[PDB]
Amino acid sequence: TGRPEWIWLALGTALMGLGTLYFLVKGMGVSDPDAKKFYAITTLVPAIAFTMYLSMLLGYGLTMVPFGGEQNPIYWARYADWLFTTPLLLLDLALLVDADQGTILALVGADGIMIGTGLVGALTKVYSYRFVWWAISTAAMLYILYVLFFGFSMRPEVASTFKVLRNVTVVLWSAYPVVWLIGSEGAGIVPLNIETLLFMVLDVSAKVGFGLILLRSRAIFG
Amino acid sequence: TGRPEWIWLALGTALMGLGTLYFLVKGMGVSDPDAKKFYAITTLVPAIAFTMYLSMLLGYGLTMVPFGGEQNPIYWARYADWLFTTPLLLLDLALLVDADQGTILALVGADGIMIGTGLVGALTKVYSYRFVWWAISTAAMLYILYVLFFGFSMRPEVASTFKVLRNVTVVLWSAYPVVWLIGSEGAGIVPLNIETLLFMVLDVSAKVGFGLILLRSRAIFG
Amino acid sequence: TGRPEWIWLALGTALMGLGTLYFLVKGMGVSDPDAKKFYAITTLVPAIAFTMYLSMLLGYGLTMVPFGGEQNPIYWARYADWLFTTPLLLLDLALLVDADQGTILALVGADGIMIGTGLVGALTKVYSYRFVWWAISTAAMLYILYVLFFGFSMRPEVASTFKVLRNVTVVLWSAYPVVWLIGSEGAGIVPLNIETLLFMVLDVSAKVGFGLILLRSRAIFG
Ligand SMILES: CC(C)CCCCCCCCCCCC[C@H](C)CCCCCCCC(C)C
Ligand SMILES: CC(C)CCCCCCCCCCCC[C@H](C)CCCCCCCC(C)C
Ligand SMILES: CC(C)CCCCCCCCCCCC[C@H](C)CCCCCCCC(C)C
Ligand SMILES: *C/C=C(C)/C=C/C=C(C)/C=C/C1=C(C)CCCC1(C)C
Ligand SMILES: *C/C=C(C)/C=C/C=C(C)/C=C/C1=C(C)CCCC1(C)C
Ligand SMILES: *C/C=C(C)/C=C/C=C(C)/C=C/C1=C(C)CCCC1(C)C
C-alpha cells in the first residue's frame, strides 16, 4: 500500500504462512506423544504469527500514539503475537530439558511481564517513560536468558539440540530490545520501514528457523 | 429495551444462569477426582456465558463498527465468552478420551486462533477483509473438527459418550460460521435480532445441552 | 503529582518492588522442585503488582468513566494485576494441600469470573448496573472462600501453614468488595486517595505479607 513497510509485512505473512503449512504437513503421522508436543507447540507459533502479520498488513494491528508531539504509528499487534508465541518458544526449550514446573512458571511469567511491559511502553504517551518500560522489560528478558543458561543427565541428543536452540534464542531475542530502542517505538533513529524489516527477519528466524532446527532433531522423540 | 434482540439476550442470560446453578448443585458431593474435573469444566462454561450474555443484555458488550459506510452494532462480548468457553468444551472432550498433551495444545491453540481471528473479523472496518478473517477462522475450526474425528482402548462407556458429544459438537459448532456469514457481522442478510436468536439457541445447546449429556454419563467417573 | 493518591501508588510500587527482589534473592539456591514452584509463584505475584502499581503511578493505568453524570477516575490497571495475581495466590494454596485438578480449575475459573466482572463493573456507565456486577463478582468470591474452607492426611506442617494462609486470605480478600463498594468505583463515600491507600495496604499484605508467611515455612519443601 501507501505504507512503505507493507512489503515486509507481506513477506512476513507469506513466510509465516508457509512455515505453518510446512510444519503442519511435516508433523502428519507423528504418533510419539513427546514428539506430538513439540510439533503442536512449534506449528502453533508461526500460525499465530501469520495471523498477526496479516493483521498488520491489512492495517488492523496498527494504532497512532501521540508522544513527542507527533502521531506515531505503533504496530500493537506484534505484542499480541509475542504474548503467546514467546512463552510457547520457551515451553519448547523447557520440555526439551524436562524442566521443573517451578522453572517453567518462572519463565512463562517473566515472559508475560516482558511482553506486557513492552506493550505498555509502546502505548505510553509520555516519551521519557517509554524507556522506563523498556528497561523493566529488558530486565525480564535478562532474567529469562539467565535461567536458560544457569538454571538447567539429559540424553546427549537432548543436550546438543538444546545448546543450539539456546544459543539461537539468546542471540535473536537479545536483538529485539535494541531494534525497539532505535526504532519508531523508542528513539526514532531508524525509520519504521527499516524497523519492520528487522523485526521480520528476527521473527522468521526465531520462529521458522528455530522450528526447522528443532523438528529436524531426534531430540524430540522418546 | 429498544433493542429488539433484548428478549433473546434476556432468555439466554436466564438459561445460562439456570444451567450454571443446576450443574453447580448437581456436582455437590462428587468426590471422584476425575468426575470433579468434568464438573468444574462443565459448570464454568455456562457461568462464563451467563456473564457475557448479561453484559450484552445491559449493553456493555456491544460496540459500533463502521463498515459498508454504516454504524454496525457488533456484540464483541460473544468473543470474550467463546475465547474461554470453547477451549473448555474441547478440554471436556479431550479428557474423556485421555488425549495426549500435544493434541490438547494443538486443539486449544487452534481454538484461540479461531476465536481471535473471528474477533478481528468482527471489528475490521474494511468490509471485504472481514471475510478474509472469517475464512481463516473457519479453517481453524475445520482443523479442530478434523482432529476430533481422525486424531483419536477407551472403556466402551467413554467411547459411547464421546461419540455422541463429538457429533453434537460438529453439528453445532459448524453452524456458527454460517450464522456469522449471513448475519450482521458478515453479509447482513439476516437481521441482528434473528442472528441473536440463532446464537442463543446454539449457545444454550452447545453449553447446557452438551453438559447435560456429559454430566449424566458414567463416562466421567474413574 | 497533582493526584493526591500518588503517594500511595509510589509507596506500593516501592514495596512491591522490594518484596519482589527479596523473594527473588531468597529463592536463590532452592533446588527442591516443590519449593521451586512456591518460589516461582510467590515471586511472580509482587513482580506483576509492581508493574501495575507503576503503571498507575505514571498515569497509564487510569481511565475516566462517565457515570452519575461525572468523569470518574477509574484505575483499571488493578484488574490487570489481579487477573493474574489472584489465581496465582490460589495456586499457592492449592499446591500446598495437593488439591485435585478439578478443584484447581474451579478455583481459577471462579477467580477469573470475579475479576472480570469486577472490571466490567468498574467500566460500566450505568450507575445502578455497576452494583449488579459487584454482586456477581462477590458471589464468585464467596464461592472461592467456600471452597478454601469446605472442599479440602496432609503432613501436619502443611495443614498448619495452610490454615494460617487460608485465614489471611479470607480476611484480606473479603475487604476488597467493601472498599470497592464504598470507594470511587461504587458509592463514592470514601475519596479516591483514601481508597488507594486501602487497596495499597491490602495488596501489600495479601502479596508480600502472604508470601513472607509462606516462604518462611518448611511446608513448601518435599
Ligand atoms: C524446508 C525448509 C528448509 C523451510 C522452507 C519453508 C519456508 C519458510 C521459512 C524457511 C526459511 C527460513 C530459514 C531460517 C533463517 C532465516 C534467517 C530466515 C530469514 C529470512 C530472510 C529471507 C531469505 C529467504 C527466504 C524466502 C527463506
Ligand atoms: C434438568 C435439565 C433437563 C435441565 C434444565 C435446566 C435449564 C436450562 C437448560 C435446559 C434445557 C436445554 C436442553 C438442551 C437443548 C436445547 C436445544 C436448548 C435450546 C433452547 C430452546 C428453548 C426451549 C426451552 C427451554 C427453556 C429449555
Ligand atoms: C524481610 C521481610 C520481613 C520483608 C521486608 C521486605 C519489604 C517489603 C514488604 C515487607 C513488609 C510487609 C509485612 C506484611 C504486612 C503488612 C500489613 C504490610 C502493610 C504495609 C504497611 C506499611 C508498614 C511498613 C512497611 C514499609 C513494611
Ligand atoms: C516470535 C518472536 C519473538 C521470539 C520475539 C521476542 C521479543 C522479545 C524478546 C522482545 C523484547 C523486548 C524487550 C526486552 C524490551 C522492550 C521491547 C521488547 C518487547 C521488544
Ligand atoms: C459456547 C459457544 C460455542 C461452542 C461457540 C462456538 C463458536 C464457534 C465454533 C465460532 C466459529 C466462527 C468461525 C469458524 C468463523 C468466524 C466466526 C466465528 C467466530 C463465529
Ligand atoms: C493481590 C491482590 C488481591 C489478593 C486482590 C483481591 C481482589 C479481590 C478479592 C477483589 C474482589 C472484588 C469483588 C468481590 C467485588 C467486585 C470488586 C472486586 C474486584 C474488588
PDB file of all heavy atoms in Angstrom, chain B residues 48 52 76-85 115 119:
ATOM      1  N   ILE B  48     -19.523 -18.598  32.668  1.00  0.00           N
ATOM      2  CA  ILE B  48     -18.888 -17.543  31.869  1.00  0.00           C
ATOM      3  C   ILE B  48     -19.861 -16.966  30.856  1.00  0.00           C
ATOM      4  O   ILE B  48     -20.009 -15.790  30.697  1.00  0.00           O
ATOM      5  CB  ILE B  48     -17.641 -18.091  31.161  1.00  0.00           C
ATOM      6  CG1 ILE B  48     -16.496 -18.370  32.158  1.00  0.00           C
ATOM      7  CG2 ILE B  48     -17.133 -17.142  30.075  1.00  0.00           C
ATOM      8  CD1 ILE B  48     -15.479 -19.364  31.635  1.00  0.00           C
ATOM      9  N   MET B  52     -21.394 -13.043  30.090  1.00  0.00           N
ATOM     10  CA  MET B  52     -21.279 -12.343  28.835  1.00  0.00           C
ATOM     11  C   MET B  52     -22.647 -12.110  28.190  1.00  0.00           C
ATOM     12  O   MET B  52     -22.824 -11.042  27.658  1.00  0.00           O
ATOM     13  CB  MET B  52     -20.296 -13.030  27.892  1.00  0.00           C
ATOM     14  CG  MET B  52     -18.843 -13.094  28.389  1.00  0.00           C
ATOM     15  SD  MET B  52     -18.184 -11.436  28.555  1.00  0.00           S
ATOM     16  CE  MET B  52     -18.579 -11.027  30.269  1.00  0.00           C
ATOM     17  N   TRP B  76     -19.315  -7.623  20.735  1.00  0.00           N
ATOM     18  CA  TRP B  76     -17.987  -8.210  20.923  1.00  0.00           C
ATOM     19  C   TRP B  76     -17.892  -9.161  22.097  1.00  0.00           C
ATOM     20  O   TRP B  76     -16.998  -9.989  22.222  1.00  0.00           O
ATOM     21  CB  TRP B  76     -16.949  -7.067  21.104  1.00  0.00           C
ATOM     22  CG  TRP B  76     -17.188  -6.221  22.339  1.00  0.00           C
ATOM     23  CD1 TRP B  76     -17.849  -5.040  22.404  1.00  0.00           C
ATOM     24  CD2 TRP B  76     -16.764  -6.503  23.689  1.00  0.00           C
ATOM     25  NE1 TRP B  76     -17.877  -4.545  23.701  1.00  0.00           N
ATOM     26  CE2 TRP B  76     -17.222  -5.426  24.492  1.00  0.00           C
ATOM     27  CE3 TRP B  76     -16.055  -7.548  24.288  1.00  0.00           C
ATOM     28  CZ2 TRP B  76     -16.995  -5.361  25.863  1.00  0.00           C
ATOM     29  CZ3 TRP B  76     -15.826  -7.488  25.656  1.00  0.00           C
ATOM     30  CH2 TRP B  76     -16.300  -6.400  26.407  1.00  0.00           C
ATOM     31  N   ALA B  77     -18.879  -8.993  23.047  1.00  0.00           N
ATOM     32  CA  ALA B  77     -18.717  -9.874  24.214  1.00  0.00           C
ATOM     33  C   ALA B  77     -18.860 -11.355  23.927  1.00  0.00           C
ATOM     34  O   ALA B  77     -18.396 -12.246  24.654  1.00  0.00           O
ATOM     35  CB  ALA B  77     -19.724  -9.446  25.292  1.00  0.00           C
ATOM     36  N   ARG B  78     -19.518 -11.677  22.783  1.00  0.00           N
ATOM     37  CA  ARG B  78     -19.512 -13.106  22.449  1.00  0.00           C
ATOM     38  C   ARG B  78     -18.119 -13.742  22.326  1.00  0.00           C
ATOM     39  O   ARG B  78     -17.876 -14.900  22.599  1.00  0.00           O
ATOM     40  CB  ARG B  78     -20.162 -13.356  21.063  1.00  0.00           C
ATOM     41  CG  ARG B  78     -21.459 -12.628  20.857  1.00  0.00           C
ATOM     42  CD  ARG B  78     -22.220 -13.395  19.754  1.00  0.00           C
ATOM     43  NE  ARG B  78     -23.458 -12.668  19.500  1.00  0.00           N
ATOM     44  CZ  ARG B  78     -24.570 -13.086  20.138  1.00  0.00           C
ATOM     45  NH1 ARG B  78     -24.489 -14.116  20.936  1.00  0.00           N
ATOM     46  NH2 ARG B  78     -25.685 -12.437  19.910  1.00  0.00           N
ATOM     47  N   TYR B  79     -17.188 -12.893  21.830  1.00  0.00           N
ATOM     48  CA  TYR B  79     -15.830 -13.419  21.624  1.00  0.00           C
ATOM     49  C   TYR B  79     -15.053 -13.571  22.946  1.00  0.00           C
ATOM     50  O   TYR B  79     -14.296 -14.517  23.094  1.00  0.00           O
ATOM     51  CB  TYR B  79     -14.971 -12.581  20.631  1.00  0.00           C
ATOM     52  CG  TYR B  79     -15.764 -12.465  19.331  1.00  0.00           C
ATOM     53  CD1 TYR B  79     -16.692 -11.450  19.187  1.00  0.00           C
ATOM     54  CD2 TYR B  79     -15.570 -13.405  18.322  1.00  0.00           C
ATOM     55  CE1 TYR B  79     -17.467 -11.287  18.052  1.00  0.00           C
ATOM     56  CE2 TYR B  79     -16.342 -13.234  17.165  1.00  0.00           C
ATOM     57  CZ  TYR B  79     -17.247 -12.213  17.054  1.00  0.00           C
ATOM     58  OH  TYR B  79     -18.029 -12.074  15.935  1.00  0.00           O
ATOM     59  N   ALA B  80     -15.337 -12.636  23.893  1.00  0.00           N
ATOM     60  CA  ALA B  80     -14.763 -12.916  25.236  1.00  0.00           C
ATOM     61  C   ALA B  80     -15.228 -14.170  25.931  1.00  0.00           C
ATOM     62  O   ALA B  80     -14.569 -14.886  26.617  1.00  0.00           O
ATOM     63  CB  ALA B  80     -15.101 -11.700  26.118  1.00  0.00           C
ATOM     64  N   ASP B  81     -16.527 -14.481  25.716  1.00  0.00           N
ATOM     65  CA  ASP B  81     -17.121 -15.734  26.161  1.00  0.00           C
ATOM     66  C   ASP B  81     -16.386 -16.912  25.531  1.00  0.00           C
ATOM     67  O   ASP B  81     -15.799 -17.739  26.187  1.00  0.00           O
ATOM     68  CB  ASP B  81     -18.621 -15.664  25.834  1.00  0.00           C
ATOM     69  CG  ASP B  81     -19.440 -16.927  26.035  1.00  0.00           C
ATOM     70  OD1 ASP B  81     -18.876 -18.012  26.082  1.00  0.00           O
ATOM     71  OD2 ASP B  81     -20.692 -16.799  26.093  1.00  0.00           O
ATOM     72  N   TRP B  82     -16.494 -16.906  24.165  1.00  0.00           N
ATOM     73  CA  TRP B  82     -16.013 -18.102  23.438  1.00  0.00           C
ATOM     74  C   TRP B  82     -14.519 -18.352  23.579  1.00  0.00           C
ATOM     75  O   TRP B  82     -14.012 -19.465  23.517  1.00  0.00           O
ATOM     76  CB  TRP B  82     -16.351 -17.877  21.951  1.00  0.00           C
ATOM     77  CG  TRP B  82     -17.798 -17.776  21.611  1.00  0.00           C
ATOM     78  CD1 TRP B  82     -18.864 -18.165  22.401  1.00  0.00           C
ATOM     79  CD2 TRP B  82     -18.360 -17.253  20.415  1.00  0.00           C
ATOM     80  NE1 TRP B  82     -20.035 -17.881  21.729  1.00  0.00           N
ATOM     81  CE2 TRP B  82     -19.789 -17.337  20.504  1.00  0.00           C
ATOM     82  CE3 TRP B  82     -17.879 -16.706  19.233  1.00  0.00           C
ATOM     83  CZ2 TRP B  82     -20.623 -16.913  19.487  1.00  0.00           C
ATOM     84  CZ3 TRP B  82     -18.729 -16.281  18.218  1.00  0.00           C
ATOM     85  CH2 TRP B  82     -20.146 -16.364  18.307  1.00  0.00           C
ATOM     86  N   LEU B  83     -13.799 -17.235  23.765  1.00  0.00           N
ATOM     87  CA  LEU B  83     -12.360 -17.395  23.962  1.00  0.00           C
ATOM     88  C   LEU B  83     -12.011 -18.344  25.079  1.00  0.00           C
ATOM     89  O   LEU B  83     -11.057 -19.122  25.119  1.00  0.00           O
ATOM     90  CB  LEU B  83     -11.779 -15.984  24.235  1.00  0.00           C
ATOM     91  CG  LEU B  83     -10.299 -16.018  24.640  1.00  0.00           C
ATOM     92  CD1 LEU B  83      -9.450 -16.412  23.450  1.00  0.00           C
ATOM     93  CD2 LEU B  83      -9.956 -14.621  25.175  1.00  0.00           C
ATOM     94  N   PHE B  84     -12.850 -18.354  26.136  1.00  0.00           N
ATOM     95  CA  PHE B  84     -12.612 -19.256  27.259  1.00  0.00           C
ATOM     96  C   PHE B  84     -13.486 -20.523  27.241  1.00  0.00           C
ATOM     97  O   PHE B  84     -13.095 -21.582  27.626  1.00  0.00           O
ATOM     98  CB  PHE B  84     -12.934 -18.490  28.554  1.00  0.00           C
ATOM     99  CG  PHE B  84     -11.995 -17.294  28.773  1.00  0.00           C
ATOM    100  CD1 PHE B  84     -12.398 -16.028  28.546  1.00  0.00           C
ATOM    101  CD2 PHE B  84     -10.695 -17.586  29.210  1.00  0.00           C
ATOM    102  CE1 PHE B  84     -11.528 -14.945  28.729  1.00  0.00           C
ATOM    103  CE2 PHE B  84      -9.811 -16.521  29.389  1.00  0.00           C
ATOM    104  CZ  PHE B  84     -10.237 -15.242  29.147  1.00  0.00           C
ATOM    105  N   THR B  85     -14.730 -20.311  26.747  1.00  0.00           N
ATOM    106  CA  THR B  85     -15.648 -21.461  26.862  1.00  0.00           C
ATOM    107  C   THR B  85     -15.376 -22.523  25.784  1.00  0.00           C
ATOM    108  O   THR B  85     -15.539 -23.705  26.040  1.00  0.00           O
ATOM    109  CB  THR B  85     -17.110 -21.031  26.769  1.00  0.00           C
ATOM    110  OG1 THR B  85     -17.416 -20.261  25.631  1.00  0.00           O
ATOM    111  CG2 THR B  85     -17.491 -20.158  28.000  1.00  0.00           C
ATOM    112  N   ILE B 115     -11.168 -18.174  17.546  1.00  0.00           N
ATOM    113  CA  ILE B 115     -11.928 -17.042  18.115  1.00  0.00           C
ATOM    114  C   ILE B 115     -11.276 -15.694  17.903  1.00  0.00           C
ATOM    115  O   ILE B 115     -11.854 -14.668  17.642  1.00  0.00           O
ATOM    116  CB  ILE B 115     -12.119 -17.339  19.637  1.00  0.00           C
ATOM    117  CG1 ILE B 115     -12.804 -18.708  19.870  1.00  0.00           C
ATOM    118  CG2 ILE B 115     -12.847 -16.207  20.303  1.00  0.00           C
ATOM    119  CD1 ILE B 115     -14.108 -18.752  19.068  1.00  0.00           C
ATOM    120  N   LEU B 119     -12.866 -12.450  16.117  1.00  0.00           N
ATOM    121  CA  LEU B 119     -12.933 -11.125  16.713  1.00  0.00           C
ATOM    122  C   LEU B 119     -12.334 -10.033  15.830  1.00  0.00           C
ATOM    123  O   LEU B 119     -12.921  -9.020  15.653  1.00  0.00           O
ATOM    124  CB  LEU B 119     -12.181 -11.195  18.075  1.00  0.00           C
ATOM    125  CG  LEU B 119     -12.214  -9.810  18.775  1.00  0.00           C
ATOM    126  CD1 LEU B 119     -13.586  -9.295  19.109  1.00  0.00           C
ATOM    127  CD2 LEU B 119     -11.344  -9.950  20.021  1.00  0.00           C
TER     128      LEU B 119
END
